[PDB]
Amino acid sequence: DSNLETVLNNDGLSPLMMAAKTGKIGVFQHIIRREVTDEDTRHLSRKFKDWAYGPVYSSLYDLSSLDTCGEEVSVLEILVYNSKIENRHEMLAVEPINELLRDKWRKFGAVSFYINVVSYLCAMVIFTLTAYYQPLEGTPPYPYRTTVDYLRLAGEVITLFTGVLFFFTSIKDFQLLYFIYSVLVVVSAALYLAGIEAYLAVMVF
Amino acid sequence: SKHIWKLQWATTILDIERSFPVFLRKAFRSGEMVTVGRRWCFRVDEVNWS
Amino acid sequence: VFNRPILFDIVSRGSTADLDGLLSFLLTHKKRLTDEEFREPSTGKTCLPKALLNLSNGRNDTIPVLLDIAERTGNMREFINSPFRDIYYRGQTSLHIAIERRCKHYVELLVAQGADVHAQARGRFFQPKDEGGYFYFGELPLSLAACTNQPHIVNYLTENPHKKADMRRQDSRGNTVLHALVAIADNTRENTKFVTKMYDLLLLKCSRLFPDSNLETVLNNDGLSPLMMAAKTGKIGVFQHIIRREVTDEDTRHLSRKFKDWAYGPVYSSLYDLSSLDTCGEEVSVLEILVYNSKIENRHEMLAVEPINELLRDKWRKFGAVSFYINVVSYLCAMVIFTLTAYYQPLEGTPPYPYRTTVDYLRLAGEVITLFTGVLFFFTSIKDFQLLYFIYSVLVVVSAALYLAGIEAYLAVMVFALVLGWMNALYFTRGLKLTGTYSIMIQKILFKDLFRFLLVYLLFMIGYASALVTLLNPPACRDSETFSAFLLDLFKLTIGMGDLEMLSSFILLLVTYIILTFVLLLNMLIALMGETVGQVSKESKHIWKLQWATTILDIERSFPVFLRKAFRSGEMVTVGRRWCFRVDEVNWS
Ligand SMILES: CN1CCN(c2nc3c(F)cccc3c(=O)n2-c2ccc(Oc3ccc(F)cc3)cc2)CC1
Ligand SMILES: CN1CCN(c2nc3c(F)cccc3c(=O)n2-c2ccc(Oc3ccc(F)cc3)cc2)CC1
């Protein structure tokens, strides 16, 4: 009815997860490639073998628990994020994981990453060119009264929206670095709202 | 580079997926239906000369 | 016998009696198994490949019944030639499936029945891995038997009583068995053994069958040829053997490479046949592809194959030291006279025609010889680090053109061309023994970190200038909404070297920002310096090998090689002119 591997400890880990977390490459290297041949009990296999063209074997590794699609705990997350792992040098090279990372890269790892880097870099450049244009001759609260100042306000508002949006991303989840970043930026924008003189200091920081 | 950079892009990929909703149509493969295993799977193609 | 699924079910389990009572009725209904309704609709596959994939440990005894059915139907070509109609596969007829299964027990029977032995498998699944496919074998049945290590299949197929297979016939890319077998090869040992042995076998078989032309000379649409493909793709495993092939059989020895000529007892003078390692600049040359090409996977060992490593030395000795030293002296003297034309450069105005006295006559002589050198070596560049001299010489000729009209202050980029030429001399002339790795450090550093600096620099400047403008500029520099670039100049001058304007006497910002910029400058400088110089150095051996290889090759490319400055010629006729290069080894056997 139920393969014994699915019985989870009070920690809610399960044998494969405990093997990964504690740093047990010896048993982890085997628990992923288990394909017990007995058909009556083959269903509890991992390295499903599907086809081959003679020189090429297309193994069908069963990552039924190497990524829960962010639903529950995932072996890849514990393997990579956790720093207490004794030896991640070889565990990442188990095989299905090393290729799952490449698959994620190809599918949604280059597009999203480059979009993100360009978005961030352009956001910071417009932040700099809002600084260089930063409201001059006093009048911090509402200086927007001309075309160039209208463009400056447009830059400032888009930058504030970017900051608050990517702060929303941070909260929904180097993360501290952006956390302090965005709290500072939103605080500075709040002080700007009232046009408090010399209070747009930590904005440049 | 080797393991340090491996971990670097691993973290980038994982937190990329964590950022936006993964459950959308941007996940990994699905496999055999029933009577043998849906039990999604990931297919790796090796080559051997046996 | 009503639908494909039941046919597949019966053939999978190896049951034939249950099918006899219905196949006879279908044959009585003037029906043929080749009809699409008898073939799986997704790909159009017949039951033959399905049954073959259902081999009972290679002992499928039903497929003879299928051949009997085919003979009864009276249709053989369409049934046997039953390609796959999807894009994932192409062709892949009974021969392909049988050979893939490593089944010699039935390929022979089905060919004896009469089967197409030249079906072209131009499939998406049959295209190189790095291009997008899964397994590439040359799109030929015989090439498929050859690639998959089936010597018996190749032998039988080329010696079957019925239609045989010709090794010469090529594929979409014009590959043939040799090209395919170079493609699948690796640099391992298990792979490189069957590949090399069977590849010599195919070559020698084609030779006996047809001694007119050795199969190695059949070139793909890329115009590469098996040796060239082996070199380019980075196949040291097969390249190391294709150059030392000396098949002893006299009837077919002529297609040998490591010709052996003489020995004095302790010394063997091998006569390697570089019939295609240098075309004297006539056609593609293996050395050029090996050295110039950067996509080559592993040039570390390929250059050390042996005939190449010694051909480079031979070129060095013959026309590699003379020409190189003449070139370096000519360039260095050209740049020195360029500098001493600059220091003398037309003075007191009068740019167009200042030549009116002895010293000015000498200056004009220097200028004209320098212009002639620039235009001549630009002619050399065009006839063919080449970009560096390209921009060099275009700049110099443009400056000379502006000089012709004597346009005031227009001889500006002339001096920039001077400095470009000097750094170019520092660049190219790396053949003066090994001195660390100067040029390679250039490229690894070059401008990479410099623009990172510039950018962080500019952001800090703008950031603290914005601090000032929200504070004072409507401070130190007269606070009157002034220019910012002067802030950059100040930051370079003092926070870089000294004599700051204090600028506060504000502070919360400036102190943190300046300590941060110092910290960043430190880390960037130190990290770059240490990591680049220490670890990734790999100073001399292969880096310098490639360096003088490039110098020698482009030296030969410069002037006409076909002149009396080439490599050796060898045996005349009845054994091989077939120029050759003799390397003298010593062994104590
Ligand atoms: C908390 N944090 C977790 C990891 N993410 C992250 N953190 C950073 C950090 F901490 C410091 C500096 C930079 C970043 C950074 O760029 N990203 C990031 C941004 C976008 C992304 O992929 C997308 C692209 C477009 C899009 F519309 C939605 C998503 C992936 C990562 C997100 C939040
Ligand atoms: C395009 N380029 C290809 C390679 N060559 C070359 N490029 C350089 C470069 F790009 C930057 C800096 C320097 C050089 C350089 O010195 N040479 C060079 C010059 C002479 C030479 O051998 C001869 C000697 C005397 C003679 F009369 C005729 C030929 C061999 C090489 C030629 C053109």
Side-chain angles (χ1 to χ4, degrees), chain C residues 33-97:
Chain C
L33 198 63
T34 59
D35 183 10
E36 55 265 19
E37 70 184 1
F38 276 111
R39 268 163 57 191
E40 196 278 332
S42 175
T43 65
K45 53 161 288 310
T46 61
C47 82
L48 291 171
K50 167 50 163 36
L52 294 174
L53 292 183
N54 308 155
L55 74 170
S56 60
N57 195 20
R59 299 261 49 75
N60 181 356
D61 295 78
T62 80
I63 62 180
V65 181
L66 279 296
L67 264 59
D68 291 331
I69 294 163
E71 291 320 316
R72 291 176 182 177
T73 49
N75 211 350
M76 61 79 71
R77 197 72 184 172
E78 287 78 2
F79 193 8
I80 298 284
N81 297 15
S82 53
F84 278 34
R85 302 185 294 92
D86 66 343
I87 312 308
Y88 204 60
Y89 298 136
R90 281 270 76 70
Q92 209 189 354
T93 197
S94 69
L95 277 296
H96 290 274
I97 301 299

Coordinates of all heavy atoms in Angstrom, one line a residue, chain C residues 33-97:
Chain C
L33 N -0.5 -5.2 -46.0 CA -0.1 -4.7 -44.7 C 0.6 -3.4 -44.8 O 0.8 -2.7 -43.8 CB 0.9 -5.7 -44.1 CG 1.1 -5.6 -42.6 CD1 -0.2 -5.9 -41.8 CD2 2.2 -6.6 -42.1
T34 N 0.9 -2.9 -46.0 CA 1.5 -1.6 -46.2 C 0.5 -0.4 -46.1 O 1.0 0.7 -46.0 CB 2.2 -1.5 -47.6 OG1 1.3 -1.8 -48.6 CG2 3.3 -2.6 -47.7
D35 N -0.8 -0.7 -46.1 CA -1.8 0.4 -46.0 C -1.6 1.1 -44.7 O -1.3 0.5 -43.6 CB -3.2 -0.2 -46.2 CG -4.2 0.9 -46.2 OD1 -3.8 2.1 -46.3 OD2 -5.4 0.6 -46.2
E36 N -1.9 2.4 -44.7 CA -1.8 3.2 -43.5 C -2.6 2.7 -42.4 O -2.2 2.8 -41.2 CB -2.1 4.7 -43.8 CG -3.5 4.9 -44.4 CD -3.5 5.0 -46.0 OE1 -2.5 4.5 -46.6 OE2 -4.4 5.5 -46.6
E37 N -3.8 2.1 -42.7 CA -4.7 1.6 -41.6 C -4.0 0.4 -40.9 O -4.5 0.0 -39.9 CB -6.0 1.2 -42.2 CG -6.0 0.0 -43.1 CD -7.3 -0.3 -43.8 OE1 -8.3 0.5 -43.5 OE2 -7.4 -1.3 -44.5
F38 N -3.0 -0.2 -41.5 CA -2.2 -1.2 -40.9 C -0.9 -0.7 -40.3 O -0.1 -1.5 -39.7 CB -1.9 -2.4 -41.9 CG -3.0 -3.4 -42.0 CD1 -3.7 -3.4 -43.2 CD2 -3.3 -4.2 -41.0 CE1 -4.7 -4.4 -43.4 CE2 -4.3 -5.2 -41.2 CZ -5.0 -5.2 -42.3
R39 N -0.7 0.6 -40.3 CA 0.5 1.2 -39.8 C 0.1 2.2 -38.7 O -0.9 2.9 -38.8 CB 1.3 1.9 -40.8 CG 2.4 1.1 -41.5 CD 2.9 1.7 -42.8 NE 3.3 3.1 -42.6 CZ 3.6 3.9 -43.6 NH1 3.4 3.5 -44.9 NH2 4.0 5.1 -43.3
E40 N 0.9 2.3 -37.6 CA 0.6 3.2 -36.5 C 0.5 4.6 -37.1 O 1.4 5.1 -37.7 CB 1.6 3.1 -35.4 CG 1.2 3.7 -34.1 CD 1.3 5.2 -34.1 OE1 2.2 5.7 -34.8 OE2 0.6 5.8 -33.3
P41 N -0.6 5.3 -36.8 CA -0.8 6.6 -37.5 C 0.1 7.7 -37.1 O 0.3 8.6 -37.9 CB -2.3 6.9 -37.2 CG -2.6 6.3 -35.9 CD -1.7 5.1 -35.8
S42 N 0.5 7.7 -35.8 CA 1.3 8.9 -35.3 C 2.6 9.1 -36.1 O 3.0 10.2 -36.5 CB 1.6 8.7 -33.8 OG 2.5 9.7 -33.4
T43 N 3.3 7.9 -36.4 CA 4.5 8.0 -37.2 C 4.5 7.1 -38.4 O 5.4 7.2 -39.3 CB 5.7 7.5 -36.3 OG1 5.5 6.1 -36.0 CG2 5.8 8.3 -35.0
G44 N 3.4 6.3 -38.6 CA 3.4 5.5 -39.8 C 4.2 4.2 -39.7 O 4.5 3.6 -40.7
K45 N 4.7 3.9 -38.5 CA 5.6 2.7 -38.3 C 4.8 1.5 -38.6 O 3.6 1.3 -38.2 CB 6.2 2.7 -36.9 CG 5.1 2.8 -35.8 CD 5.7 2.3 -34.5 CE 5.8 0.8 -34.4 NZ 4.6 0.1 -34.9
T46 N 5.4 0.5 -39.3 CA 4.8 -0.8 -39.5 C 5.0 -1.7 -38.2 O 5.7 -1.3 -37.3 CB 5.4 -1.5 -40.7 OG1 6.8 -1.7 -40.5 CG2 5.2 -0.7 -41.9
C47 N 4.4 -2.8 -38.2 CA 4.5 -3.8 -37.1 C 5.9 -4.4 -37.1 O 6.3 -5.0 -36.1 CB 3.5 -4.9 -37.2 SG 3.9 -6.2 -38.3
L48 N 6.7 -4.3 -38.2 CA 8.0 -4.8 -38.2 C 8.9 -4.2 -37.2 O 9.6 -4.9 -36.4 CB 8.6 -4.7 -39.6 CG 8.0 -5.6 -40.7 CD1 8.6 -5.2 -42.1 CD2 8.3 -7.1 -40.4
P49 N 9.1 -2.9 -37.1 CA 9.9 -2.2 -36.1 C 9.4 -2.5 -34.7 O 10.2 -2.7 -33.8 CB 9.9 -0.7 -36.4 CG 8.7 -0.6 -37.3 CD 8.6 -1.8 -38.1
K50 N 8.1 -2.6 -34.5 CA 7.5 -2.9 -33.2 C 8.0 -4.3 -32.7 O 8.5 -4.5 -31.6 CB 6.0 -2.8 -33.2 CG 5.3 -3.4 -32.0 CD 5.9 -2.9 -30.7 CE 4.9 -3.2 -29.5 NZ 4.2 -4.5 -29.7
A51 N 7.8 -5.3 -33.6 CA 8.2 -6.6 -33.3 C 9.7 -6.7 -33.0 O 10.2 -7.4 -32.1 CB 7.8 -7.6 -34.4
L52 N 10.5 -6.0 -33.8 CA 12.0 -6.0 -33.6 C 12.3 -5.4 -32.3 O 13.2 -5.9 -31.6 CB 12.6 -5.2 -34.8 CG 12.5 -5.8 -36.2 CD1 13.1 -4.9 -37.2 CD2 13.2 -7.2 -36.2
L53 N 11.7 -4.3 -31.9 CA 11.9 -3.8 -30.6 C 11.4 -4.7 -29.5 O 11.7 -4.5 -28.3 CB 11.1 -2.4 -30.5 CG 11.7 -1.3 -31.3 CD1 11.0 0.0 -31.0 CD2 13.2 -1.1 -31.0
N54 N 10.5 -5.7 -29.8 CA 10.0 -6.7 -28.9 C 10.9 -7.9 -28.9 O 10.4 -9.0 -28.7 CB 8.6 -7.0 -29.2 CG 7.7 -5.8 -29.2 OD1 6.6 -5.8 -29.8 ND2 8.1 -4.7 -28.5
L55 N 12.1 -7.8 -29.3 CA 13.0 -9.0 -29.4 C 13.0 -9.8 -28.1 O 13.2 -9.2 -27.0 CB 14.4 -8.6 -29.8 CG 15.3 -7.9 -28.8 CD1 16.7 -7.8 -29.3 CD2 14.8 -6.5 -28.4
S56 N 12.9 -11.1 -28.2 CA 12.9 -12.0 -27.1 C 14.4 -12.4 -26.8 O 14.9 -13.4 -27.2 CB 12.1 -13.2 -27.2 OG 12.5 -13.9 -28.4
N57 N 15.1 -11.5 -26.2 CA 16.6 -11.6 -26.0 C 17.3 -11.9 -27.3 O 18.2 -12.7 -27.5 CB 16.9 -12.8 -25.1 CG 18.3 -12.8 -24.5 OD1 19.0 -11.8 -24.6 ND2 18.8 -13.9 -24.1
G58 N 16.9 -11.1 -28.4 CA 17.4 -11.3 -29.7 C 16.9 -12.5 -30.4 O 17.5 -12.8 -31.5
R59 N 15.9 -13.2 -29.9 CA 15.4 -14.4 -30.5 C 13.9 -14.3 -30.8 O 13.1 -15.2 -30.5 CB 15.6 -15.6 -29.5 CG 17.1 -15.8 -29.2 CD 17.7 -17.0 -30.0 NE 17.4 -16.8 -31.4 CZ 18.0 -16.0 -32.2 NH1 18.9 -15.1 -31.8 NH2 17.7 -15.9 -33.5
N60 N 13.6 -13.2 -31.5 CA 12.2 -13.1 -32.0 C 12.0 -14.0 -33.2 O 12.5 -13.7 -34.3 CB 11.9 -11.6 -32.3 CG 10.5 -11.4 -32.8 OD1 9.7 -12.3 -32.9 ND2 10.2 -10.1 -33.0
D61 N 11.1 -15.0 -33.0 CA 10.9 -16.0 -34.0 C 9.6 -15.7 -34.8 O 9.2 -16.5 -35.6 CB 10.8 -17.4 -33.4 CG 12.1 -17.9 -32.8 OD1 12.4 -17.4 -31.7 OD2 12.8 -18.7 -33.4
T62 N 9.0 -14.6 -34.6 CA 7.8 -14.2 -35.3 C 8.1 -13.4 -36.6 O 7.3 -13.6 -37.6 CB 6.8 -13.3 -34.4 OG1 7.3 -12.0 -34.4 CG2 6.8 -13.9 -33.0
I63 N 9.1 -12.6 -36.6 CA 9.5 -11.8 -37.7 C 9.7 -12.6 -39.0 O 9.4 -12.1 -40.1 CB 10.7 -10.9 -37.4 CG1 11.9 -11.7 -37.1 CG2 10.4 -10.0 -36.2 CD1 13.1 -10.9 -36.9
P64 N 10.1 -13.9 -38.9 CA 10.1 -14.7 -40.1 C 8.7 -14.8 -40.7 O 8.5 -14.8 -41.9 CB 10.7 -16.0 -39.7 CG 10.7 -16.0 -38.2 CD 10.9 -14.6 -37.9
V65 N 7.7 -15.0 -39.8 CA 6.3 -15.0 -40.3 C 5.9 -13.7 -40.9 O 5.1 -13.7 -41.9 CB 5.4 -15.4 -39.1 CG1 3.9 -15.4 -39.6 CG2 5.8 -16.7 -38.4
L66 N 6.4 -12.6 -40.4 CA 6.2 -11.3 -41.0 C 6.8 -11.2 -42.4 O 6.1 -10.6 -43.3 CB 6.7 -10.2 -40.1 CG 5.8 -9.8 -38.9 CD1 4.5 -9.2 -39.4 CD2 5.6 -11.0 -38.0
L67 N 8.0 -11.7 -42.6 CA 8.6 -11.7 -43.9 C 7.7 -12.6 -44.8 O 7.6 -12.3 -46.0 CB 10.0 -12.3 -43.8 CG 11.1 -11.2 -43.7 CD1 10.9 -10.3 -42.5 CD2 12.5 -11.8 -43.7
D68 N 7.2 -13.7 -44.3 CA 6.3 -14.6 -45.1 C 5.1 -13.8 -45.5 O 4.7 -13.9 -46.7 CB 6.0 -15.8 -44.3 CG 7.1 -16.8 -44.1 OD1 8.0 -16.8 -45.0 OD2 7.1 -17.5 -43.1
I69 N 4.5 -13.0 -44.6 CA 3.4 -12.2 -44.9 C 3.7 -11.2 -46.0 O 3.0 -11.0 -46.9 CB 2.8 -11.5 -43.7 CG1 2.3 -12.6 -42.7 CG2 1.8 -10.5 -44.0 CD1 2.1 -12.1 -41.3
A70 N 4.9 -10.6 -45.9 CA 5.3 -9.6 -46.9 C 5.4 -10.2 -48.2 O 5.0 -9.7 -49.2 CB 6.7 -9.0 -46.4
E71 N 6.0 -11.4 -48.3 CA 6.2 -12.1 -49.6 C 4.8 -12.4 -50.2 O 4.6 -12.3 -51.4 CB 7.0 -13.3 -49.4 CG 8.5 -13.1 -49.1 CD 9.1 -11.9 -49.9 OE1 8.8 -11.8 -51.1 OE2 9.8 -11.1 -49.3
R72 N 3.9 -12.9 -49.3 CA 2.6 -13.2 -49.8 C 1.8 -12.0 -50.3 O 1.2 -12.1 -51.4 CB 1.7 -13.9 -48.6 CG 2.2 -15.3 -48.2 CD 1.4 -15.8 -47.0 NE 1.9 -17.1 -46.6 CZ 1.4 -17.7 -45.5 NH1 0.5 -17.2 -44.8 NH2 1.9 -18.9 -45.2
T73 N 2.0 -10.9 -49.6 CA 1.3 -9.7 -50.1 C 1.7 -9.2 -51.5 O 1.0 -8.6 -52.2 CB 1.5 -8.5 -49.1 OG1 2.9 -8.4 -48.8 CG2 0.8 -8.8 -47.8
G74 N 3.0 -9.6 -51.9 CA 3.5 -9.2 -53.1 C 4.1 -7.8 -53.1 O 4.7 -7.4 -54.2
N75 N 4.1 -7.1 -52.0 CA 4.7 -5.8 -51.9 C 5.9 -5.9 -50.9 O 5.7 -6.3 -49.7 CB 3.7 -4.8 -51.4 CG 4.0 -3.4 -51.9 OD1 5.0 -3.1 -52.5 ND2 3.0 -2.5 -51.7
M76 N 7.0 -5.5 -51.3 CA 8.2 -5.5 -50.5 C 8.9 -4.2 -50.3 O 9.3 -3.9 -49.1 CB 9.3 -6.5 -51.2 CG 9.7 -6.0 -52.6 SD 11.0 -4.7 -52.5 CE 12.4 -5.6 -51.9
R77 N 9.0 -3.3 -51.3 CA 9.7 -2.1 -51.1 C 8.9 -1.2 -50.1 O 9.5 -0.8 -49.1 CB 9.7 -1.3 -52.5 CG 10.7 -0.2 -52.5 CD 12.2 -0.7 -52.5 NE 13.1 0.4 -52.5 CZ 14.4 0.2 -52.3 NH1 15.0 -1.0 -52.2 NH2 15.2 1.3 -52.3
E78 N 7.6 -1.0 -50.3 CA 6.9 -0.1 -49.4 C 6.9 -0.7 -48.0 O 7.1 0.0 -47.0 CB 5.5 0.1 -49.9 CG 5.4 1.1 -51.1 CD 5.8 0.4 -52.4 OE1 6.1 -0.8 -52.4 OE2 5.8 1.1 -53.4
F79 N 6.7 -2.0 -47.9 CA 6.7 -2.6 -46.5 C 8.0 -2.5 -45.9 O 8.2 -2.1 -44.8 CB 6.2 -4.1 -46.7 CG 5.9 -4.7 -45.3 CD1 5.8 -4.0 -44.2 CD2 5.7 -6.1 -45.3 CE1 5.5 -4.6 -43.0 CE2 5.4 -6.7 -44.1 CZ 5.3 -6.0 -42.9
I80 N 9.1 -2.9 -46.6 CA 10.4 -2.8 -46.1 C 10.8 -1.4 -45.9 O 11.3 -1.0 -44.8 CB 11.4 -3.6 -47.0 CG1 11.1 -5.0 -47.1 CG2 12.8 -3.4 -46.5 CD1 11.5 -5.8 -45.9
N81 N 10.6 -0.5 -46.9 CA 10.9 0.9 -46.9 C 9.6 1.5 -46.3 O 8.8 2.0 -47.0 CB 11.3 1.5 -48.2 CG 12.5 0.9 -48.8 OD1 13.0 -0.1 -48.3 ND2 13.1 1.6 -49.8
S82 N 9.6 1.5 -44.9 CA 8.4 2.1 -44.2 C 8.9 3.1 -43.2 O 9.0 2.9 -42.0 CB 7.7 0.9 -43.4 OG 8.7 0.2 -42.6
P83 N 9.3 4.3 -43.8 CA 9.9 5.4 -42.9 C 8.9 5.8 -41.9 O 7.8 5.4 -41.8 CB 10.2 6.5 -43.9 CG 9.3 6.2 -45.1 CD 9.1 4.8 -45.2
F84 N 9.4 6.7 -41.0 CA 8.6 7.4 -40.0 C 8.2 8.7 -40.5 O 9.0 9.5 -40.9 CB 9.4 7.5 -38.7 CG 9.4 6.2 -37.9 CD1 9.4 5.0 -38.5 CD2 9.4 6.3 -36.5 CE1 9.4 3.8 -37.7 CE2 9.5 5.1 -35.7 CZ 9.5 3.9 -36.4
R85 N 6.9 9.0 -40.4 CA 6.3 10.2 -41.0 C 6.3 11.4 -40.0 O 6.0 12.5 -40.5 CB 4.8 9.9 -41.3 CG 4.7 8.8 -42.3 CD 3.2 8.6 -42.8 NE 2.4 8.2 -41.7 CZ 1.7 9.0 -40.9 NH1 1.8 10.3 -41.1 NH2 0.9 8.5 -40.0
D86 N 6.8 11.2 -38.8 CA 7.0 12.4 -37.9 C 8.3 13.0 -38.1 O 9.2 12.5 -38.7 CB 6.8 11.9 -36.4 CG 7.9 11.0 -36.0 OD1 8.6 10.4 -36.9 OD2 8.1 10.8 -34.8
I87 N 8.5 14.2 -37.5 CA 9.7 14.9 -37.6 C 10.8 14.4 -36.6 O 12.0 14.5 -36.9 CB 9.5 16.4 -37.4 CG1 8.4 17.0 -38.3 CG2 10.8 17.2 -37.8 CD1 8.5 16.6 -39.7
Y88 N 10.3 13.8 -35.5 CA 11.3 13.3 -34.5 C 12.1 12.2 -35.1 O 13.3 12.0 -34.7 CB 10.5 12.8 -33.3 CG 11.3 12.7 -32.0 CD1 11.8 13.9 -31.5 CD2 11.5 11.5 -31.4 CE1 12.5 13.9 -30.3 CE2 12.2 11.5 -30.2 CZ 12.7 12.7 -29.7 OH 13.4 12.6 -28.5
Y89 N 11.7 11.5 -36.2 CA 12.4 10.5 -36.8 C 12.3 10.6 -38.3 O 11.3 11.1 -38.8 CB 11.9 9.1 -36.4 CG 12.1 8.8 -34.9 CD1 11.1 8.2 -34.2 CD2 13.3 9.1 -34.2 CE1 11.3 7.9 -32.8 CE2 13.5 8.8 -32.9 CZ 12.5 8.2 -32.2 OH 12.6 7.9 -30.9
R90 N 13.3 10.1 -39.0 CA 13.2 10.0 -40.5 C 13.8 8.7 -40.9 O 14.6 8.1 -40.3 CB 14.1 11.1 -41.1 CG 13.4 12.5 -41.2 CD 12.6 12.6 -42.5 NE 11.3 11.9 -42.4 CZ 10.3 12.2 -41.7 NH1 10.3 13.2 -40.9 NH2 9.2 11.4 -41.8
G91 N 13.2 8.1 -42.0 CA 13.6 6.8 -42.5 C 13.5 5.8 -41.4 O 12.4 5.5 -41.0
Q92 N 14.6 5.3 -40.9 CA 14.6 4.4 -39.8 C 13.8 3.1 -40.1 O 13.0 2.7 -39.4 CB 14.1 5.0 -38.5 CG 14.6 4.5 -37.2 CD 13.9 5.0 -36.0 OE1 13.1 5.9 -36.1 NE2 14.3 4.5 -34.8
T93 N 14.2 2.5 -41.3 CA 13.5 1.3 -41.8 C 14.0 0.1 -41.0 O 14.7 0.2 -40.0 CB 13.6 1.2 -43.3 OG1 12.6 0.3 -43.8 CG2 15.0 0.7 -43.6
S94 N 13.6 -1.1 -41.5 CA 13.9 -2.3 -40.8 C 15.4 -2.5 -40.6 O 15.8 -3.0 -39.6 CB 13.4 -3.5 -41.6 OG 14.1 -3.7 -42.8
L95 N 16.2 -2.0 -41.6 CA 17.7 -2.1 -41.4 C 18.1 -1.3 -40.2 O 18.9 -1.8 -39.4 CB 18.4 -1.7 -42.7 CG 18.5 -2.7 -43.8 CD1 19.4 -3.9 -43.3 CD2 17.2 -3.2 -44.2
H96 N 17.7 -0.1 -40.1 CA 18.1 0.8 -39.0 C 17.7 0.1 -37.7 O 18.5 0.0 -36.8 CB 17.4 2.1 -39.1 CG 17.9 3.0 -40.2 ND1 19.0 3.8 -40.1 CD2 17.5 3.1 -41.5 CE1 19.3 4.4 -41.3 NE2 18.3 4.0 -42.1
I97 N 16.4 -0.3 -37.6 CA 16.0 -0.9 -36.3 C 16.7 -2.1 -36.0 O 17.2 -2.3 -34.8 CB 14.5 -1.1 -36.4 CG1 13.7 0.2 -36.7 CG2 14.0 -1.7 -35.1 CD1 13.9 1.3 -35.6

